[PDB]
PDB file of all heavy atoms in Angstrom:
ATOM      1  N   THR X  74      47.673  -4.541  13.009  1.00 51.86           N
ATOM      2  CA  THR X  74      48.263  -3.309  13.521  1.00 51.86           C
ATOM      3  C   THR X  74      47.733  -3.002  14.922  1.00 51.86           C
ATOM      4  O   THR X  74      46.542  -2.954  15.124  1.00 51.86           O
ATOM      5  CB  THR X  74      48.040  -2.175  12.525  1.00 51.86           C
ATOM      6  OG1 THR X  74      48.708  -2.487  11.320  1.00 51.86           O
ATOM      7  CG2 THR X  74      48.547  -0.837  13.039  1.00 51.86           C
ATOM      8  N   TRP X  75      48.662  -2.884  15.900  1.00 50.30           N
ATOM      9  CA  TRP X  75      48.331  -2.603  17.280  1.00 50.30           C
ATOM     10  C   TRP X  75      48.900  -1.225  17.625  1.00 50.30           C
ATOM     11  O   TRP X  75      50.119  -1.150  17.917  1.00 50.30           O
ATOM     12  CB  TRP X  75      48.908  -3.704  18.191  1.00 50.30           C
ATOM     13  CG  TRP X  75      48.656  -3.583  19.670  1.00 50.30           C
ATOM     14  CD1 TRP X  75      48.714  -2.466  20.482  1.00 50.30           C
ATOM     15  CD2 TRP X  75      48.418  -4.686  20.577  1.00 50.30           C
ATOM     16  NE1 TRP X  75      48.459  -2.803  21.785  1.00 50.30           N
ATOM     17  CE2 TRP X  75      48.301  -4.158  21.886  1.00 50.30           C
ATOM     18  CE3 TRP X  75      48.295  -6.057  20.394  1.00 50.30           C
ATOM     19  CZ2 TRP X  75      48.045  -4.948  22.976  1.00 50.30           C
ATOM     20  CZ3 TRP X  75      48.072  -6.867  21.489  1.00 50.30           C
ATOM     21  CH2 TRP X  75      47.957  -6.314  22.783  1.00 50.30           C
ATOM     22  N   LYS X  76      48.087  -0.188  17.555  1.00 50.49           N
ATOM     23  CA  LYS X  76      48.530   1.161  17.834  1.00 50.49           C
ATOM     24  C   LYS X  76      48.628   1.274  19.362  1.00 50.49           C
ATOM     25  O   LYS X  76      47.864   0.668  20.077  1.00 50.49           O
ATOM     26  CB  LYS X  76      47.563   2.195  17.245  1.00 50.49           C
ATOM     27  CG  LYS X  76      47.452   2.127  15.707  1.00 50.49           C
ATOM     28  CD  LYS X  76      46.365   3.062  15.169  1.00 50.49           C
ATOM     29  CE  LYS X  76      46.416   3.257  13.675  1.00 50.49           C
ATOM     30  NZ  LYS X  76      47.673   3.965  13.268  1.00 50.49           N
ATOM     31  N   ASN X  77      49.615   2.062  19.855  1.00 49.78           N
ATOM     32  CA  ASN X  77      49.890   2.083  21.271  1.00 49.78           C
ATOM     33  C   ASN X  77      49.062   3.028  22.126  1.00 49.78           C
ATOM     34  O   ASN X  77      49.141   2.956  23.356  1.00 49.78           O
ATOM     35  CB  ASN X  77      51.364   2.350  21.500  1.00 49.78           C
ATOM     36  CG  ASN X  77      52.241   1.231  20.932  1.00 49.78           C
ATOM     37  OD1 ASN X  77      51.878   0.021  21.010  1.00 49.78           O
ATOM     38  ND2 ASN X  77      53.353   1.611  20.369  1.00 49.78           N
ATOM     39  N   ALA X  82      45.103  -0.889  23.210  1.00 45.91           N
ATOM     40  CA  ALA X  82      46.245  -0.665  24.089  1.00 45.91           C
ATOM     41  C   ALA X  82      45.795  -0.379  25.522  1.00 45.91           C
ATOM     42  O   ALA X  82      46.389  -0.919  26.466  1.00 45.91           O
ATOM     43  CB  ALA X  82      47.077   0.509  23.614  1.00 45.91           C
ATOM     44  N   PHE X  85      44.423  -3.600  27.054  1.00 46.54           N
ATOM     45  CA  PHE X  85      45.499  -4.522  27.383  1.00 46.54           C
ATOM     46  C   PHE X  85      46.165  -4.062  28.684  1.00 46.54           C
ATOM     47  O   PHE X  85      46.470  -4.902  29.532  1.00 46.54           O
ATOM     48  CB  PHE X  85      46.528  -4.623  26.244  1.00 46.54           C
ATOM     49  CG  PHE X  85      47.577  -5.676  26.561  1.00 46.54           C
ATOM     50  CD1 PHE X  85      47.234  -7.018  26.599  1.00 46.54           C
ATOM     51  CD2 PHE X  85      48.853  -5.307  26.922  1.00 46.54           C
ATOM     52  CE1 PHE X  85      48.161  -7.979  26.928  1.00 46.54           C
ATOM     53  CE2 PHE X  85      49.798  -6.269  27.230  1.00 46.54           C
ATOM     54  CZ  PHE X  85      49.452  -7.619  27.244  1.00 46.54           C
ATOM     55  N   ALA X  86      46.365  -2.756  28.845  1.00 48.66           N
ATOM     56  CA  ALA X  86      46.926  -2.240  30.099  1.00 48.66           C
ATOM     57  C   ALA X  86      45.999  -2.580  31.275  1.00 48.66           C
ATOM     58  O   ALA X  86      46.474  -2.917  32.356  1.00 48.66           O
ATOM     59  CB  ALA X  86      47.180  -0.760  29.982  1.00 48.66           C
ATOM     60  N   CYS X  89      46.699  -6.150  32.270  1.00 49.34           N
ATOM     61  CA  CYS X  89      47.940  -6.223  33.013  1.00 49.34           C
ATOM     62  C   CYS X  89      47.769  -5.690  34.440  1.00 49.34           C
ATOM     63  O   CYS X  89      48.176  -6.362  35.395  1.00 49.34           O
ATOM     64  CB  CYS X  89      49.051  -5.505  32.294  1.00 49.34           C
ATOM     65  SG  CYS X  89      49.529  -6.355  30.751  1.00 49.34           S
ATOM     66  N   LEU X 130      48.487 -11.892  14.789  1.00 72.10           N
ATOM     67  CA  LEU X 130      48.814 -11.288  16.069  1.00 72.10           C
ATOM     68  C   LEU X 130      49.508 -12.336  16.943  1.00 72.10           C
ATOM     69  O   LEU X 130      48.864 -13.187  17.525  1.00 72.10           O
ATOM     70  CB  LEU X 130      47.565 -10.764  16.792  1.00 72.10           C
ATOM     71  CG  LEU X 130      47.785 -10.116  18.157  1.00 72.10           C
ATOM     72  CD1 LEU X 130      48.806  -9.028  18.062  1.00 72.10           C
ATOM     73  CD2 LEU X 130      46.474  -9.593  18.743  1.00 72.10           C
ATOM     74  N   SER X 132      52.324 -14.212  19.756  1.00 68.42           N
ATOM     75  CA  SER X 132      52.739 -14.187  21.140  1.00 68.42           C
ATOM     76  C   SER X 132      53.904 -13.230  21.370  1.00 68.42           C
ATOM     77  O   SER X 132      53.968 -12.586  22.423  1.00 68.42           O
ATOM     78  CB  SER X 132      53.090 -15.578  21.639  1.00 68.42           C
ATOM     79  OG  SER X 132      54.177 -16.082  20.888  1.00 68.42           O
ATOM     80  N   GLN X 133      54.800 -13.099  20.359  1.00 70.10           N
ATOM     81  CA  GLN X 133      55.920 -12.170  20.441  1.00 70.10           C
ATOM     82  C   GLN X 133      55.472 -10.713  20.480  1.00 70.10           C
ATOM     83  O   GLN X 133      56.046  -9.903  21.228  1.00 70.10           O
ATOM     84  CB  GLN X 133      56.892 -12.377  19.275  1.00 70.10           C
ATOM     85  CG  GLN X 133      57.622 -13.722  19.327  1.00 70.10           C
ATOM     86  CD  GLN X 133      56.819 -14.913  18.793  1.00 70.10           C
ATOM     87  OE1 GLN X 133      55.693 -14.795  18.251  1.00 70.10           O
ATOM     88  NE2 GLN X 133      57.385 -16.085  18.934  1.00 70.10           N
ATOM     89  N   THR X 134      54.378 -10.372  19.758  1.00 66.58           N
ATOM     90  CA  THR X 134      53.820  -9.028  19.800  1.00 66.58           C
ATOM     91  C   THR X 134      53.240  -8.748  21.180  1.00 66.58           C
ATOM     92  O   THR X 134      53.453  -7.661  21.731  1.00 66.58           O
ATOM     93  CB  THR X 134      52.809  -8.798  18.664  1.00 66.58           C
ATOM     94  OG1 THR X 134      53.494  -8.880  17.415  1.00 66.58           O
ATOM     95  CG2 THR X 134      52.106  -7.481  18.727  1.00 66.58           C
ATOM     96  N   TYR X 135      52.526  -9.721  21.731  1.00 67.48           N
ATOM     97  CA  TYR X 135      51.962  -9.590  23.077  1.00 67.48           C
ATOM     98  C   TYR X 135      53.067  -9.340  24.128  1.00 67.48           C
ATOM     99  O   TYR X 135      52.900  -8.524  25.022  1.00 67.48           O
ATOM    100  CB  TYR X 135      51.158 -10.827  23.492  1.00 67.48           C
ATOM    101  CG  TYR X 135      49.689 -10.839  23.120  1.00 67.48           C
ATOM    102  CD1 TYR X 135      49.238 -11.483  21.981  1.00 67.48           C
ATOM    103  CD2 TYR X 135      48.748 -10.178  23.909  1.00 67.48           C
ATOM    104  CE1 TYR X 135      47.888 -11.520  21.669  1.00 67.48           C
ATOM    105  CE2 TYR X 135      47.395 -10.207  23.587  1.00 67.48           C
ATOM    106  CZ  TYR X 135      46.977 -10.867  22.468  1.00 67.48           C
ATOM    107  OH  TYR X 135      45.661 -10.899  22.141  1.00 67.48           O
ATOM    108  N   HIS X 136      54.217 -10.029  23.968  1.00 70.64           N
ATOM    109  CA  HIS X 136      55.337  -9.818  24.869  1.00 70.64           C
ATOM    110  C   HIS X 136      55.820  -8.364  24.785  1.00 70.64           C
ATOM    111  O   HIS X 136      56.080  -7.741  25.834  1.00 70.64           O
ATOM    112  CB  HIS X 136      56.474 -10.805  24.635  1.00 70.64           C
ATOM    113  CG  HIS X 136      57.554 -10.652  25.641  1.00 70.64           C
ATOM    114  ND1 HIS X 136      57.375 -11.016  26.951  1.00 70.64           N
ATOM    115  CD2 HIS X 136      58.762 -10.072  25.558  1.00 70.64           C
ATOM    116  CE1 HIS X 136      58.468 -10.723  27.629  1.00 70.64           C
ATOM    117  NE2 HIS X 136      59.320 -10.140  26.817  1.00 70.64           N
ATOM    118  N   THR X 137      55.933  -7.830  23.567  1.00 69.99           N
ATOM    119  CA  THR X 137      56.376  -6.461  23.393  1.00 69.99           C
ATOM    120  C   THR X 137      55.423  -5.517  24.107  1.00 69.99           C
ATOM    121  O   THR X 137      55.871  -4.584  24.796  1.00 69.99           O
ATOM    122  CB  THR X 137      56.548  -6.125  21.907  1.00 69.99           C
ATOM    123  OG1 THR X 137      57.611  -6.951  21.391  1.00 69.99           O
ATOM    124  CG2 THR X 137      56.891  -4.651  21.668  1.00 69.99           C
ATOM    125  N   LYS X 138      54.117  -5.777  24.008  1.00 68.03           N
ATOM    126  CA  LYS X 138      53.118  -4.919  24.641  1.00 68.03           C
ATOM    127  C   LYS X 138      53.140  -5.016  26.174  1.00 68.03           C
ATOM    128  O   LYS X 138      52.941  -4.007  26.835  1.00 68.03           O
ATOM    129  CB  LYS X 138      51.726  -5.227  24.084  1.00 68.03           C
ATOM    130  CG  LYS X 138      51.662  -5.125  22.552  1.00 68.03           C
ATOM    131  CD  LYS X 138      52.158  -3.805  21.973  1.00 68.03           C
ATOM    132  CE  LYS X 138      52.158  -3.819  20.460  1.00 68.03           C
ATOM    133  NZ  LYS X 138      52.547  -2.462  19.966  1.00 68.03           N
ATOM    134  N   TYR X 139      53.350  -6.231  26.705  1.00 69.79           N
ATOM    135  CA  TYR X 139      53.548  -6.428  28.128  1.00 69.79           C
ATOM    136  C   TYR X 139      54.756  -5.626  28.620  1.00 69.79           C
ATOM    137  O   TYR X 139      54.695  -4.941  29.652  1.00 69.79           O
ATOM    138  CB  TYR X 139      53.707  -7.931  28.441  1.00 69.79           C
ATOM    139  CG  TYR X 139      54.417  -8.191  29.795  1.00 69.79           C
ATOM    140  CD1 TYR X 139      53.774  -7.964  31.002  1.00 69.79           C
ATOM    141  CD2 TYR X 139      55.724  -8.605  29.796  1.00 69.79           C
ATOM    142  CE1 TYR X 139      54.426  -8.191  32.211  1.00 69.79           C
ATOM    143  CE2 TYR X 139      56.395  -8.815  30.996  1.00 69.79           C
ATOM    144  CZ  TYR X 139      55.745  -8.612  32.201  1.00 69.79           C
ATOM    145  OH  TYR X 139      56.501  -8.838  33.326  1.00 69.79           O
ATOM    146  N   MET X 140      55.863  -5.677  27.852  1.00 66.56           N
ATOM    147  CA  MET X 140      57.066  -4.954  28.254  1.00 66.56           C
ATOM    148  C   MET X 140      56.854  -3.425  28.150  1.00 66.56           C
ATOM    149  O   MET X 140      57.384  -2.704  28.984  1.00 66.56           O
ATOM    150  CB  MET X 140      58.324  -5.384  27.427  1.00 66.56           C
ATOM    151  CG  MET X 140      58.769  -6.791  27.728  1.00 66.56           C
ATOM    152  SD  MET X 140      59.076  -7.137  29.479  1.00 66.56           S
ATOM    153  CE  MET X 140      60.256  -5.821  29.909  1.00 66.56           C
ATOM    154  N   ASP X 141      56.053  -2.983  27.195  1.00 67.97           N
ATOM    155  CA  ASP X 141      55.669  -1.573  27.153  1.00 67.97           C
ATOM    156  C   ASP X 141      54.892  -1.132  28.410  1.00 67.97           C
ATOM    157  O   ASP X 141      55.108  -0.043  28.943  1.00 67.97           O
ATOM    158  CB  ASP X 141      54.847  -1.269  25.919  1.00 67.97           C
ATOM    159  CG  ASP X 141      55.555  -1.348  24.582  1.00 67.97           C
ATOM    160  OD1 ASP X 141      56.810  -1.443  24.585  1.00 67.97           O
ATOM    161  OD2 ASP X 141      54.845  -1.366  23.550  1.00 67.97           O
ATOM    162  N   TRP X 142      54.013  -2.019  28.910  1.00 69.18           N
ATOM    163  CA  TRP X 142      53.278  -1.774  30.141  1.00 69.18           C
ATOM    164  C   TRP X 142      54.231  -1.705  31.322  1.00 69.18           C
ATOM    165  O   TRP X 142      54.120  -0.812  32.166  1.00 69.18           O
ATOM    166  CB  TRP X 142      52.219  -2.855  30.341  1.00 69.18           C
ATOM    167  CG  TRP X 142      51.525  -2.788  31.669  1.00 69.18           C
ATOM    168  CD1 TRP X 142      50.528  -1.939  32.040  1.00 69.18           C
ATOM    169  CD2 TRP X 142      51.752  -3.661  32.786  1.00 69.18           C
ATOM    170  NE1 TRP X 142      50.112  -2.226  33.313  1.00 69.18           N
ATOM    171  CE2 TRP X 142      50.842  -3.259  33.798  1.00 69.18           C
ATOM    172  CE3 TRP X 142      52.599  -4.728  33.050  1.00 69.18           C
ATOM    173  CZ2 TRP X 142      50.804  -3.897  35.045  1.00 69.18           C
ATOM    174  CZ3 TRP X 142      52.525  -5.380  34.259  1.00 69.18           C
ATOM    175  CH2 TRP X 142      51.642  -4.982  35.243  1.00 69.18           C
ATOM    176  N   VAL X 143      55.154  -2.650  31.406  1.00 68.54           N
ATOM    177  CA  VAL X 143      56.173  -2.603  32.462  1.00 68.54           C
ATOM    178  C   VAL X 143      56.971  -1.319  32.453  1.00 68.54           C
ATOM    179  O   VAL X 143      57.139  -0.673  33.506  1.00 68.54           O
ATOM    180  CB  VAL X 143      57.087  -3.851  32.401  1.00 68.54           C
ATOM    181  CG1 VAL X 143      58.246  -3.734  33.379  1.00 68.54           C
ATOM    182  CG2 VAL X 143      56.314  -5.134  32.663  1.00 68.54           C
ATOM    183  N   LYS X 144      57.461  -0.929  31.271  1.00 66.77           N
ATOM    184  CA  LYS X 144      58.320   0.240  31.108  1.00 66.77           C
ATOM    185  C   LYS X 144      57.601   1.568  31.275  1.00 66.77           C
ATOM    186  O   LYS X 144      58.228   2.553  31.628  1.00 66.77           O
ATOM    187  CB  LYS X 144      58.996   0.206  29.745  1.00 66.77           C
ATOM    188  CG  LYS X 144      60.063  -0.870  29.629  1.00 66.77           C
ATOM    189  CD  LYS X 144      60.951  -0.657  28.422  1.00 66.77           C
ATOM    190  CE  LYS X 144      61.927  -1.776  28.219  1.00 66.77           C
ATOM    191  NZ  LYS X 144      61.248  -3.036  27.793  1.00 66.77           N
TER     192      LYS X 144
END
Side-chain angles (χ1 to χ4, degrees):
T74 296
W75 180 319
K76 297 174 168 294
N77 296 323
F85 186 69
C89 292
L130 179 56
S132 61
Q133 293 81 6
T134 295
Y135 272 97
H136 184 71
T137 295
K138 305 306 176 176
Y139 159 73
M140 292 306 306
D141 293 347
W142 172 78
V143 172
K144 289 194 185 70

